[PDB]
Ligand binder design. Structure first.
Ligand SMILES: *[C@@H]1O[C@H](CO)[C@@H](O[C@@H]2O[C@H](CO)[C@@H](O)[C@H](O)[C@H]2NC(C)=O)[C@H](O)[C@H]1NC(C)=O
Ligand SMILES: *[C@@H]1O[C@H](CO)[C@@H](O)[C@H](O)[C@H]1NC(C)=O
Ligand SMILES: *[C@@H]1O[C@H](CO)[C@@H](O)[C@H](O)[C@H]1NC(C)=O
Ligand SMILES: *[C@@H]1O[C@H](CO)[C@@H](O)[C@H](O)[C@H]1NC(C)=O
Lengths: 128, 106, 103, 115, 116
């Protein structure tokens, strides 16, 4: 009996080079006993069940009592110019708030241009 | 960022400037920041002060009810043009709350 | 345009981000990340005690931002206690370390 | 990255997608050849809601952080009977992305700035 | 700076300014211990030419050079009706009073991290 850890991943960099579609994966692990299902909402509106494909709870490679599941969803490539953040969610009985909404966006991810601009003064005693 | 309200004069003679009035602050200034260095030079402020040039043509009236303060400047000349700011606190720069521009078509 | 990830006032760190459009194409849209720390230099170690030595080392674990403190806040009052021997009567009094912000 | 920084075993996924007919044999190897392949788990082919005739797969490999953060690549292989040589493989590591240049702009002028 | 060149004794001042009305009360303590009233001198409120109906006052403390050069810390507490807490204080030492060195150890880590 442990908290069901959850994660989300963005589409692959080389995947955005054929201009057909894109896939977003929400990984759900743990949740012992295995009681989870994911509903992919966007802007608070649930998506069609035909889009996301959850499969089954599967035991972890080393499974004393733990399990895991994977669920993906298919979108269109040209819609990623705006993101829409395509939120994921999980549900389990071993959760104080029984919801762990997880969402990512083109903006979220790995940065490619760091621009640190630190400054040094003697009148910065108070943060205005 | 905070608004960039702009005002004009339509030939000299009078002008009126309004800026928001913050709460829990005792100082209010209208420095012109028209210097090459950029360091804003307080023109008319509370806590007792005024500009060597701007005298007798500058006054401040704070109205807590409307959350605004009013400054009235009589006449008009070439020197008192450009841009102006407003703010509070005890640091003329880093304490601004507006960036107003003053111009005259004369 | 820029969203704000961190607005800490204790460390004056403003982490933000923006994506710039490429040369009329949806590819190579390079992302950005701007960090702006403003070191105090004139503040003490224990900011609420005006006796500790000056603050030399500045450690910034960016992960935590997105408890020892560095700067003051324009919206709060800092106070302390000092002994006064008026009339040979040692007495503790609350002193407004940061005045004009305690009104 | 949220998984790495939390001190938890990193999991790498190989998203085999688009194979028809539904037959694929994914394998995970390090330093040249696989070691105890049962270490990872994979899923059976499943349909799509788009296009007539497609299948997708999955795979998960669990590795500790003190190894993932230090060397090796953990390549993935796909064995479908329509490939030019019947074998195709992709590979990832820490530095599979972009250089991500810096633009440090330190300032030591106490007179102008601080904005 | 010139006074310290002589390496004889150092004088620290405390300029109160622009308080109406008069009768401000000023005292000095060294590293949390109050000093004798006879080790410093306090002026009396005097008119302010630039500001009508405003007053100002001075106060000076004298100590040996060795004491100033041992990082000892001195403060100038004041008491006035206008003061919101009725008491406020400022503090200086060797390192803070117009220093000749800015020793800094800027250090940051995990710049990438996970930020949301
Ligand atoms: C920094 O200074 C504060 C204030 O003196 C220290 O906390 C105080 O400790 C005293 C007892 O030593 C208590 O009477 C106060 O109530 C405490 N202050 C507060 C706000 O609770 C603090 O320990 C000092 N920090 C270090 C590292 O010395
Ligand atoms: C980097 O930061 C500086 C300071 O804010 C700014 O002037 C400059 O435009 C930034 N560069 C980019 C590419 O955003
Ligand atoms: C580097 O920083 C400067 C500002 O300091 C900015 O003008 C420039 O665009 C930056 N370089 C890149 C590649 O963004
Ligand atoms: C200056 O900093 C260094 C560490 O960076 C320290 O060893 C040294 O003592 C500092 N100087 C003084 C005068 O404290």
């Amino acid at each position: 009996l442990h908290r069901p850890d959850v994660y989300l991943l963005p589409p692959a960099r080389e995947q955005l080079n054929l201009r057909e579609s894109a896939t977003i994966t929400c990984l759900v692990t743990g949740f012992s006993p295995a009681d989870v299902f994911v509903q992919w909402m966007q802007r608070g509106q649930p998506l069609s069940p035909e889009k996301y494909v959850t499969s089954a709870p599967m035991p972890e490679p080393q499974a004393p009592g733990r399990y895991f599941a994977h669920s993906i969803l298919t979108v269109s490539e040209e819609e990623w110019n705006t993101g829409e953040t395509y939120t994921c969610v999980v549900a389990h009985e071993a959760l104080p708030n029984r919801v762990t909404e997880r969402t990512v966006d083109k903006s979220t991810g790995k940065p490619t241009l760091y621009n640190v601009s630190l400054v040094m003064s003697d009148t910065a005693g108070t943060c205005y | 960022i905070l608004p960039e309200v702009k005002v004009e004069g339509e030939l000299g003679g009078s002008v009126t400037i309004k800026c928001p009035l913050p709460e829990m602050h005792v100082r209010i200034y209208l420095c012109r920041e028209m210097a090459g260095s950029g360091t804003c030079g307080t023109v008319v402020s509370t806590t007792n002060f005024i500009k060597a040039e701007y005298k007798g043509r500058v006054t401040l009236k704070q109205y807590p009810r409307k959350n605004l303060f009013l400054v009235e400047v009589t006449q008009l000349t070439e020197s008192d043009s450009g841009v102006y700011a407003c703010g509070a606190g005890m640091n003329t720069d880093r304490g601004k709350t507006q960036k107003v521009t003053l111009n005259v078509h004369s | 345009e820029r969203i704000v990830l961190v607005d800490n006032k204790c460390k004056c760190a403003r982490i933000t981000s923006r994506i710039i459009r490429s040369s009329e194409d949806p590819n190579e849209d390079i992302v950005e990340r701007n960090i702006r720390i403003i070191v105090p230099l004139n503040n003490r170690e224990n900011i609420s005690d005006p006796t500790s030595p000056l603050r030399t080392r500045f450690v910034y674990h960016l992960s935590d931002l997105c408890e020892t403190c560095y700067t003051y806040d324009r919206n709060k009052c800092y106070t302390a206690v000092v002994p006064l021997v008026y009339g040979g009567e040692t007495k503790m009094v609350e002193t407004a370390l940061t005045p004009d912000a305690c009104y």
